[PDB]
């Protein structure tokens, strides 16, 4: 019935835009075929729609954002229920729309999203690799379009007047390349040199101009914080990671998010995390910083406001460094090698942070 | 001094043949740049050579085989020592030369081989994916050529009259695609449907026209068989897997190879395994078969000769099926689901096999 719900796309346009040659510079355009269904998979689609946009900036107008706005205005016209949405999209999301869609999914317990992509946009770029990881951690099921998905998108969204889908040569080969790329980037862990150069707690003198943050989530069960090995992650920033964790899909109760950040939060980040833990009493926040970041501004007030709003803030010591090496680093069986003076630098930084957070004088 | 030992290749030829676009149908030819060094990495190369061939059949004349023959006659002209060999090869090995090189490496403790490949040949084909796995398990270090390796092969094997290497557009993007593909196929495990459709022990009535074999290796340490989790594997057939395990790389002394095969060995395979365990007293062989394969010929004599030569032969029961599901299958956390009548079919097959192996009558 999708054929009657949408204005189908020209066959030329489909063959041109959903060709899955990994590298294709010349295709300015993104096409997003979406179908909306109830949670019952047997049921037919309630609605479907084709969105289009350009890949280049003003991502406000990218088909993903158009979908979000349309869907928000669509759900208000039907009774509240649970939805399964499927996308066939010719390019995978940019970084901005990965963040947007991921926060939408993480805050909405009634939506499930499966994204089949024909090609990976900027698959070579660490920012977009991270963006896809963020999408997947928010709960979106990311997949490369295979022959079956191209066939189904032909049958449902393309004006292929009875004519069946005929594949181009190398469709499966492209699928193999792209699916391997997506899998490895989804399972990717931090490079060891990245880790040791960014989490070293000796006084800065080169690099380290970016912030790295690893995080784990635990849930309350029986007066006992029990971990969730499936909801870990690490992010690089050179709006607030708590907005990307789906506190709803997890075992229903209260949670403790433990954070390991190479630099202590900037002012903005501190205020965003404080606002989050204020409006989410079921989430406790623990922050471990490798170094204290002094922005010459209000960073002290930022940390103090974060602390007032319930976050526990400490400096990383050997235990936390070793945990992050063992959990978030592509270590290759090799053990954590502490650098010289780790514990002493950690104790001094702890004293500094103690002075920063202290309210009453003795 | 690799620009004095070899007849360097034309720059045109290098850029044409080492372009790393994954799909390149038109390149008939394989180029293999090899350098031979002592175990000391600081030391300069003792020798170097450029081999060429065609990708298409008569693999006797592929550059890998020409290297093997050249190297065999080269080692006889120098004192016995340990060698580190490096290849820069424009296409990765075919299946036949993967087998040849892998058995050469598995039988020779004094050679180390690193293969950098510009492109993956038939990366989409399960036979070639398995071939690369076989190479890696024999000990070859398989890697995709990156910018640094292209620069090296330019500097060492190409007549680039002082001119430096200048990369083509998309070299890193291609590297990302190819390296992800190589990693995924190197870590690939058996599809769940493949496993249960091929290892089901109820009487044949469809499919199962191929043999699947999973294997683990253990080493003797203080009268206690201790496993080697890094030397497992699984193979599909439509010469003998024992010739591909490097019984020299492992912690020395004696070993026990445990085999789980969907069909019991054909006559040929039984005789090859028997010949192997005869000429390798430090290796014990245990075989577990899911079904008994009756080739209308001498299969009974094959199993009896394998048993006479010291191999332990049994039929798989629940324990072995569950172990293979847990070890060699991409199960995704899902537990082994035994089919109905598994244990009873296993007991009947065990009775049949007992009758086959019985020598003295009671
Ligand atoms: Zn976008
Ligand atoms: Zn070959």
Author numbering:
A (entry chain A), B (entry chain B): 4 to 142, 147 to 245, 260 to 383
What does the paper say about this structure?
Two fl rA3G mutational constructs (termed FKL and E/Q) yielded well-behaved proteins and crystals in different conditions that diffracted to 2.47 and 2.40 Å, respectively. The E/Q construct was crystallized in different pH and salt conditions but consistently showed the same structure and dimerization via CD1-CD1 interactions, primarily through direct packing of several residues on h6 (K180, L184, A187), loop 1 (I26) and loop 7 (F126, W127) from both subunits. While the FKL structure shows a canonical fold of its CD2 domain, the E/Q structure shows significant alteration in CD2 conformation, with major changes on helix 2 (h2), loop 3, loop 4, and the Zn-active center. The long h2 of the CD2 in the FKL structure has become a short 310 helix (h2′) in the E/Q structure, resulting in a disordered 14-residue stretch spanning parts of loop 3 and h2 (residues A246 to E259). The shift to a short 310 h2 and extended random coil structure is necessary to avoid clashing in this tight packing conformation. However, this also disrupts the conformation of the CD2 Zn-active center within the regions of h2 and loop 3 that become disordered, resulting in no Zn-coordination. When aligning the FKL and E/Q structures via their CD1 domain, the CD2 domain of the E/Q structure shows a rotation of ~29° compared with the CD2 of FKL structure, causing the E/Q CD2 domain to shift ~15 Å downward and ~8 Å toward CD1, and resulting in a much closer packing interaction with CD1. In the E/Q structure, the two domains interact mainly through h3, h4, and h6 of CD1 with h2′, β2, loop 4 and loop 10 of CD2. Additionally, E/Q* carrying individual mutations F126Y, K180S/L184S, or CD2Δloop3 (as in FKL structure) are all active, even though the activity of the FKL* construct (with E259A reverted back to E259) with the combined mutations is less than E/Q* and WT. These results suggest that even though the crystallized E/Q structure, lacking Zn in the CD2 domain, represents a catalytically inactive A3G structural state, reverting the catalytic residue back to E259 can fully restore its deaminase activity comparable to WT.
